[model samples]
Target: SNIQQYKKTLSSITSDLRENALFKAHTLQQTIPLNIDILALFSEIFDLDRGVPAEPDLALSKEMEKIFHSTYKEISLVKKEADGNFRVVASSRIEQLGKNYNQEIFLSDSQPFLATLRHSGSDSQVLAVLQTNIFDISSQEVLGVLYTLSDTNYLLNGLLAAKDSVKTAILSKNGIILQATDSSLDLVSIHKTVSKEQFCDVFLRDDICPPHLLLRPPLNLDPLPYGENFVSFCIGNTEMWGYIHSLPEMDFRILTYEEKSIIFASLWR
Candidate 1:
């Protein structure tokens, strides 16, 4: 009975994550076309004619500040240079102007890219969920890219319930935790526990069976087959019950889990 309740709770958390992601994606999808028009109208302000200028356009800086309010955590515009490098042209934050974004802006037509960025003036890395659109506006072939970033902590903490015993995390396909719930198993402590290695290292051995490249294991997880939703396994010494939901379009997995003892304690309570 407690197991059933546990499954139900994790399922609800999974659904919330799904809804939150879809909502942001839909918001960006609706906003991108009009924003593309806006960027096109201000082509000269972005110096699309020339990749980058000695000084950025103050008008565009103000425009992006206005635009940044309409949506997610941050918004930035990048221009593809004649030499094929990407330059951050305008952003809500003026400090980012003229920075190189070649490593961050991978050209993808229909996917949200995820990467870690160093916090401004801080050494810690902040994971960013980036929605990017590459465009050639007004038949001008400017090849400008627009980025909208969703904060990793905002996305994860929004779904964290007020329970220390249960924890949730979003993991990359490679098994690195992108974001984790606020709990005893916080991102920092969890990273330290595993030495920032792939969660798979805690459970799966490197050898046999060629290992499933897809996220799957007692720690890292694979998508459930159709009609299957919950998986129970062990994470080293801890007994864990987990729910794995795949974001196939984004190639990420969402995990929710709790110790067996916690579940039993709740049952008794």
Candidate 2:
């Protein structure tokens, strides 16, 4: 009953949410394959017990050495040892981001994992890792762990970029804002939990509830353009268009946006 009323208000979102889900699912199809490619790339670079020269030897082939230095990129790769240690094999900044991953998220066996200081993800307060396990396919045993360490901001930005003001965010299952794009929506100001949050619960900043942003006269709240009306709060009366997508596996929702004028500027008659 309450869920029905909640759904009725976000009428601004229903169609977009369904469409965004279909669109995200399509992109994810390509994303997973490319992600698997990165996994293969790092595994080749690491070479571990397979192509390694022997114990305690750290060396790379001329081609790999060329690529590592040629790239000179920000992505850092580390070797997780048996004693729960990381050997800084190649990186642009080992000292700052070194050992950033929590030592526990790794599996005793070969499994995909990521570690973040924050529960959902982080911006600056936490260091995050994009990790893939090293498994002996022959014996089907996991030998060690390997990870790509970087900022959650960097990775999520790439995923949500393309739009100039399309704010994107990931929230906890219980409606807490976890990962989000930079904005002045005052989501951080929201702390009190609203029991009427329902499906839209995850999208409200802590102190917000449904339909609070609907009054044209505006609430005592800051004049956020895209709040209850849209996923990304507007700047000052811009036609805001947006939606939220909840990722099932992680129980986190992703908020994104589309401005009408921007789409108009790019569209061809």
Candidate 3:
């Protein structure tokens, strides 16, 4: 059935995201050791927000360049201050450098560091995949935090199932949209308030619209007898189907939706 096909696609998408996340985490562990020396070498340079130095040390410059050329779109270092607050001392992007910034950092031995954060100077929030290495200068002293930010597009790079009338989106546990195939959906500065127009725009339909609650995922109803992955939904005068798979490890869910008419009509008419 088409629902089965969507389930397969959603599985692949989730696998890709999980693998990419793991790969980045693994890469960070390996790369950090090789480039850790740069922190000491560029202490003054980073502190002054000088960016890439004019008279750069050959070896240190090479290490910095390697980081710049990697998949990471941006890199920054934050120092742990005496008051237990974090301060941005250096950044690959100069615009992000030299600031007294404070944010929460969760320490985990196994899980990769990831968060949704607003850009340094902008109010726009983004789904940020971060690889971090803690810099502890002495056995008992902590120096700061070093991290690289991957491009936000990575969140949607696995969205391969969105074809034809099928619509897909990744949503936070609380229903905040991380990314969606329906570009018309507001990803920023908007809350989860599904409307008839939004439904029409997404499913490419005009004659009928699902209830506002149906479109917002993690819906109130229970899944069909087959399993939790399959949702047999009745909206208005027609039936609909979708797949909602949750990745609890990543703290997000993958949603797939399409009208029953589109799925069934193709078989005979």
Candidate 4:
């Protein structure tokens, strides 16, 4: 009887611990589990194979190129829909595990057989119209929305746990004050309400005289002297895009334009 009780307790504890661990892991893993699975599948496929050395010729490369081109054509034909803005697009599907089983899956079926296909659906299937000017702003908005939806409790707790003044300041902004314990209010007050003038003043101020303008001081060695050298505007997370107009003789004029492009590029062999 003692042995039976011990076994029962052990089973209960193991189940509790496993469930708890999974709950904690899912909080972090849900965002990137599909990506991890895709990468692991690729690793298994491309592990060093025992084979006779082939000559250094273009045959393999040319073959692989053709395969990749064909694969790209297939993906371009997959299910896709534009976001609220015509610029953003997204796609999703209930990936079939087998003939009978269909479950929500983010990973692509083609990733594991990349060498054969010469392209992986997991690489990058979705496309958004490149909003070169306001791209960063759109990206940040998406990230904020996702984070709020996934863990509103975590966000609310973080906000409430801060100093009262900081909490008050955040409340004073366009968003609502989140209760620490209530999860239902997570989505309730998440959307911000602000006037166009307020939005422009708080987030988008192009006026030169604004005190908050991030100004890069003029260099003494430069030919252009005694003028506002550089002023930056916030575009998105870790990005800023603004004009660097010359204030020659205290008169602002568009002398020339400069842009910092942040492009995400990939290379595969």
Candidate 5:
């Protein structure tokens, strides 16, 4: 589910929101919160409330550009007029989002970072769009928002780099198969078949052991940067011994299935 879909649709809401919003984009959830949470970092560095000077911060774009070369393919500076429309002022590459878009819906969207996943009409693929509000340097006036987008392959970015012999798959704490090995056996079967199902209907649809697993308490408990758990997950109905590690940078899991025989031999040693 798109996290932005959770952006409260109400025109105005209280700090103590009485009810959770109802809605979702046709795509991934939870992970979107990660980028949304990072806007504070961007604001600290990029916020120029003084005003949009005659020469915009093109240098800052270059500073932020290096990381994109390795990951995202597009960078856009979209001007958000007071009436709440969007028009791209600058971009690395833009197609549909380049032109004027009357995005009044964004007025209800959250602050600092207004990120969403959008389908690229021409490319026929999803683009990860992240935007942060910009300001006029003087008088702290309204200027626009900064938008960033990733290519079609953005979803599987980290998993494509995993090296392994046996089948493997990546999963959310919620058991959504974010990425998976071709065949996939794991240290053990945590649930049913990773291949046969997208996620336990109990979890994804109805909600399960669930999103709470990724919340603060457990998240704080996990040793990160590089750490492992003996827990294994079954893939394609095949079971084996394995290691599940953390990808701190991406907030993803690294699941590796080692042959059962190798684990047995190591135990004997």
Candidate 6:
């Protein structure tokens, strides 16, 4: 049974590799040596040395320039007034290509467009402008916003379950249940019986649970009442019954029988 589960999980991973095109492209890019001239990009933008310019990697530089050109189109200039205030201004096509790239746009009256010229040491503001289009801001912006809004601490703490000693329980959408060890059989059985499912899926097919299948606590669930006891709440697909529980000292807990049964029935469909 364990071997069968292992094969199933392995099959899923193989399927993912074939399906994920972006991952394949990124892997290919990493294998190739970096050829863009880092020194030249920094030197021209920040007045730093290009160092003994090695024969320019023309292929890589052209790719890099294309990326920069596309990014420069999205940003607009914000001008500063005499009273020391700033306002955002949309850049004309000519203005963006000619003037905006040269740091002619000011952030506001209080902040200069190129404030590093007045400072002695490296100014973060200057460094940011020089490196603006060098990195993929579109991807970074999307991911950054998600990270800021997510509960990162819960994710980080969940990683601790990697140790072999860590115990966990997984119940499938159809009331199939599995646990980290045989010691968890009693708890797993209780869940099955309460859910009235003849069988529950066990998740011990791999050394660790698959990341995508890892169940997260549902949002908007009421916080557990402050005490030493355990509390359970229903969760998951609206059409199916699912419940999640929180234990006083445990890192993970179980879903109620009603919850598991609902998931089991829905998953089967």
- Per-candidate TM-scores read 0.55, 0.49, 0.51, 0.16, 0.39, 0.19
- Residue 172's lDDT in candidate 5: 41
lDDT of each: 0.49, 0.43, 0.45, 0.22, 0.41, 0.26
Task: Report the Cα lDDT for candidate 6.
Answer: 0.26
Per-residue lDDT tens digits for candidate 2, residues 122-191, read 2232123344566666864554454443334445556555553445544445544444454443233222
What stretches of model 5 exceed 4 Å from their correct place?
1-72, 83-89, 98-133, 139-142, 150-174, 181-230, 241-253
Angstrom error of the Cα, residue 253, model 2: value is: 2.7
lDDT of 5 by residue, 7-125 (tens): 33211221111111111111235455345444455456555454333333455456556534455666555666667666654444434344563441242334545544333433234
Over 4 Å off, model 3: 1-71, 104-112, 115-127, 131-142, 154-161, 164-166, 188-226, 229-240, 265-269
* Predicted structure with the largest lDDT when compared to the true one: 1
After superposition on all CA atoms, what RMSD does each candidate show versus the true structure?
9.2, 10.1, 11.2, 25.8, 16.4, 20.6
lDDT of 4 by residue, 1-269 (tens): 99787655434323322333334323323332232343233225422122111222234334323543332221110111123211111111112101111111111322321110000112211111101111123332211000000122332244234242111111112222112122222111222332222222121112212332223221111221212322222212332222222212111112111122321111111
**Candidate 6 segments whose C-alpha is farther than 4 A from its true place:** 2-13, 16-269
Q: Give a tens-digit lDDT track for model 1, residues 1-269.
A: 99787677655544533454445444324432344444454454444544434345556767777766555455677776778777777777677777787655654644323332212212222344343455444544546576555444444454444353456665555444444553323232222123324433221122212134232322434343332555555566777555655655454555666665665555445
Superior by lDDT: candidate 2 or candidate 3 = 3
lDDT for model 5: 0.41
> How does candidate 2 fare on TM-score?
0.49
Instruction: Give the winner by lDDT: 1 or 4.
Output: 1
Which candidate leads the pack in TM-score?
Answer: 1
Model 2, runs deviating above 4 Å: 1-13, 25-29, 32-35, 43-46, 49-80, 84-128, 150-167, 172-182, 185-243, 249-252, 257-269
Give me the overall lDDT of model 1.
Answer: 0.49
Q: Which stretches in model 1 have alpha-carbon errors above 4 Å?
A: 1-55, 66-73, 109-128, 138-142, 152-154, 162-166, 182-237, 262-269
Candidates 2 and 4 compared: the better one by TM-score is 2
- Steric clash pairs (candidate 1): 215-221, 215-222, 216-221, 216-222
